[PDB]
């Protein structure tokens, strides 16, 4: 079984998963790799949205088998400051593209060699086999080289050419002229007119020698449109000078009006591709797929410029015929071969760029979710609810370790609310929770949080987003962990766990691709490729897991946290589960982290990759566990650098190197009691002396091995702030600032004249038609304008996000 060798091999689990297996480099193919990656992944795209660093990163990844986290987090001096974690991820992604292109090039080179052998057995390949195949810097021009090969040599797997050659300026020369923008190669006259040469070749397929002229022009057009140089020049022309024309289809004119997303570009005219926004072209292509819109990509001319080259000057009247034939051959080639294919290529590139922006937006949103810290374990009480109309509210007190301790149900109306408040206060007094979190669903969250505040002040109370809790509730894992609890109780535990630490909850509830895709990272998330979006999200998870480090001894004791050691560097689903299985079977919990290889069977390369990103809670151990404890194991420091720590501590204590009493362990076990002593050590002078001894540059590593001994796994996440009023508005309302289109038409229900007209929106937002339109402050009520109770649809003219109030319009003139 593949899983068996994957768990048994010595390479990172994520290295075997990739389709293109990681094969070593040569330092000459590696340099070409770096140049190609730098040129292609760091080139300006078509829509508005150091090489030694790439060389070092590629060398690490492909020869040292260092995962992107281990390069980012322990190889900074090699890649920084010009390469970061996401840059390393992009480099490793583009390595796959380089390998694919190289394999394609090798296959095509072998084909061209076999074809050369076959021809030698019998045009031919003299420098094209070298010039083209060797000079293939993209998959697109690889198609240009191959398809050009198929045009001529594709016939043989084991006479219109006469006219085409008698057409002047052989296609390679036409490509040269186009690339130079001037007639580098002159045309070749003939001592006759096209028809006379036509009589020679007009025999069976093309009688009526005009037909042989048509055939010859078609052959010339094929040869021109298949020429790699003409392909390059025309693709560049499309890239720089490309317009986007859009019109709505019969199905599109009617159903796209100020609310369909394609309204802003329902009609376009000469919209340059350079001005396409982040995801605008993705929306354009989605609208075109829906059949309510039609587009085309062109430059309008360019044909007039091109025709000047494949042409001759004199007016002999026997070259005007040749000139006209050449002009119309170029016309046909451009109109039916080059324009269409170049439009297809440009459309694919633009759509892929829009997809990439959408994926990046989803990744950034996930980053913001996972980069939100814990709160300041802690006993967290989580309150969750629903419409609340004949539906109770559940609050769950989740222990600091993350395990729910107990729950409480909180189901004329005034006395019932009073009794609920009394029982909630009783619960809070009995079991004091550090933080009370209220889920975010609607306006009722504000009232719930305010009541909780009124209770607590007689200890914080914070509103919490409710979107991962819903996914947890609907998931089967919630049923598995809590067979007795109702769904709303699952929401409370999810909210408490997320507030305690989002990463630990996001990884546990987003256990599969389907679960992660349930979340809403971006409106167009559903249209991007599933593989790329999933890879981006898992890369964000890996980054935040390695930048946090996963505490081993807690993932075992509390199996809720097991999901975190999937995203550890070096240590994957199979590898992580195998490590957990080994720990469980041995019935032993890591007193020490160099113990990984000692008690488990994980290879040198995996240990190197993973072990920097595993935490050991050395302050929590006691009883029989006191028997064996390596004190450095409680930190971000890794067992290749454990000698430099035990020198840095000795030097910071000014221990006499000549005293047999300089115990380097005891020096650390004094520095980890008094970390302020490490401030008196000159790390730059210490690093220069390590470099002189031949240990290499370690300046940045020593600053980490200091900052880490100053605080064991120093958390860098931004603290759990309370959401800004904008956050509350977009959370409880469940729509974004873009969704609140000032001037949007909304169906609202009128409730009652408190001097204005209170209209309740379906979005849970109060709508106040202004008295200006109402025209009655002390005058008779606005009943004449509209009857109270029913629903009307109007247009927004103002917003009150801090109060959940939005202006409306009564006049149809505003509606227009």
């Amino acid at each position: 079984d593949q899983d068996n060798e994957i768990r048994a091999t010595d390479l990172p689990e994520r290295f075997q998963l990739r389709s293109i297996p990681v094969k070593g480099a040569e330092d000459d193919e590696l340099e070409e790799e770096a140049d190609w990656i730098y040129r292609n992944a760091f080139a300006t795209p078509t829509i508005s949205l150091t090489i030694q660093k790439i060389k070092e990163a590629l060398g690490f990844m492909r020869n040292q088998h260092f995962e992107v986290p281990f390069i980012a987090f322990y190889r900074k001096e090699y890649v920084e400051p010009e390469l970061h974690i996401n840059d390393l991820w992009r480099v490793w992604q583009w390595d796959e593209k380089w390998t694919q292109l190289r394999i394609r090039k090798e296959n095509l080179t072998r084909l061209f060699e076999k074809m050369q052998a076959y021809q030698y057995e019998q045009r031919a390949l003299d420098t094209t086999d070298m010039e083209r195949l060797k000079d293939v810097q993209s998959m697109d021009e690889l198609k240009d080289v191959y398809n050009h090969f198929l045009l001529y040599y594709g016939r043989d797997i084991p006479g219109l050419d006469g006219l085409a050659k008698k057409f002047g300026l052989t296609p390679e020369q036409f490509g040269e002229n186009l690339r130079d923008s001037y007639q580098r190669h002159e045309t070749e006259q003939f001592p006759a007119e096209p028809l006379e040469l036509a009589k020679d070749y007009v025999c069976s397929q093309f009688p009526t020698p005009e037909a042989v002229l048509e055939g010859a022009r078609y052959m010339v057009a094929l040869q021109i449109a298949r020429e790699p140089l003409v392909r390059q020049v025309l693709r560049q022309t499309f890239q720089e000078r490309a317009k986007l024309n859009i019109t709505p289809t019969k199905k599109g004119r009617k159903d796209v009006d100020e609310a369909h997303y394609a309204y802003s570009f329902k009609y376009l005219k000469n919209k340059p591709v350079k001005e396409l926004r982040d995801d605008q072209f993705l929306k354009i292509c989605l609208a075109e797929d829906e059949g309510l819109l039609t587009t085309d990509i062109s430059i309008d001319t360019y044909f007039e410029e091109i025709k000047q080259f494949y042409y001759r000057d004199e007016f002999s009247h026997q070259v005007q015929e040749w000139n006209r034939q050449r002009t119309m051959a170029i016309e046909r080639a451009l109109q039916q071969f080059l324009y269409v294919q170049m439009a297809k290529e440009l459309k694919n590139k633009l759509l892929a760029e829009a997809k990439e922006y959408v994926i990046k937006a989803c990744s950034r949103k996930l980053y913001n979710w996972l980069r939100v810290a814990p709160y300041r374990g802690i006993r967290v009480l989580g309150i969750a609810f629903s419409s609340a109309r004949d539906h109770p509210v559940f609050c769950a007190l989740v222990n600091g370790e993350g395990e729910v301790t107990d729950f409480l149900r909180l189901p004329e109306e005034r006395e019932k609310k009073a009794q609920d408040i009394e029982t909630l206060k009783k619960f809070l007094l009995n079991k004091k929770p550090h933080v009370v979190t209220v889920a975010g669903e609607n306006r009722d969250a504000q009232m719930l949080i305010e009541d909780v505040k009124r209770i607590v002040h007689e200890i914080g109370v914070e509103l919490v987003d409710n979107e991962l809790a819903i996914l947890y509730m609907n998931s089967k894992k919630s049923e598995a962990e809590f067979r007795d609890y109702p769904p709303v109780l699952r929401q409370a535990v999810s909210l408490a766990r997320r507030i305690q630490d989002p990463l630990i909850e996001f990884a546990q509830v987003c256990s599969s691709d389907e679960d992660i895709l349930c979340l809403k990272f971006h409106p167009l998330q559903e249209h991007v490729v599933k593989e790329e979006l999933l890879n981006a999200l898992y890369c964000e998870f890996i980054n935040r897991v390695n930048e946090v480090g996963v505490d081993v001894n807690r993932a075992i004791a509390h199996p809720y946290s097991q999901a975190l050691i999937q995203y550890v560097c070096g240590l994957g689903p199979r590898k992580g589960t195998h490590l957990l299985k080994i720990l469980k079977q041995n019935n032993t919990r890591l007193e020490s982290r160099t113990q990984l290889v000692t008690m488990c069977h994980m290879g040198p390369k995996v240990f190197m990759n993973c072990a920097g990103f595993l935490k050991i809670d050395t302050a929590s151990l006691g009883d029989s566990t006191d028997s064996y404890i390596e004190v450095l194991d409680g930190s971000r420091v890794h067992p290749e650098t454990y000698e430099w720590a035990r020198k840095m501590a000795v030097d910071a204590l000014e221990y006499d190197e000549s005293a047999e009493d300089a115990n380097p362990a005891g020096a650390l076990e004094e520095i980890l009691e008094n970390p302020e002593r490490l401030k008196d050590l000159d790390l730059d002078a210490f690093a220069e002396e390590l470099e002189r001894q031949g240990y290499g540059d370690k300046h940045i590593t020593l600053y980490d091995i200091r900052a880490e001994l100053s605080c064991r796994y120093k958390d860098l996440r931004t603290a759990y702030r309370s959401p800004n009023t904008e956050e509350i508005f977009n959370m409880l309302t469940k729509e974004t600032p873009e969704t609140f289109y000032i001037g949007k038409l909304i169906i609202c229900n009128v409730t009652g004249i408190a001097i204005g007209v209170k209209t309740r929106l379906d979005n849970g937002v109060t709508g106040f038609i202004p008295t200006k339109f109402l025209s009655d402050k002390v005058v008779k009520r606005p009943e004449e304008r509209v009857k109270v109770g029913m629903t009307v649809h109007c247009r927004i003219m103002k917003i009150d996000i801090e109060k959940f109030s939005a202006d409306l319009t009564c006049r149809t003139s505003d509606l227009m």
Binding site: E654, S658, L678, L681, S710
Partner: peptide, 16 residues
């Protein structure tokens, strides 16, 4: 004998 010490000669002021 063969010996080395990281020098406490540092002018960086104990990181405050």
């Amino acid at each position: 004998k063969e010996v080395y010490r990281i020098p406490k000669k540092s002018q960086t002021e104990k990181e405050n």
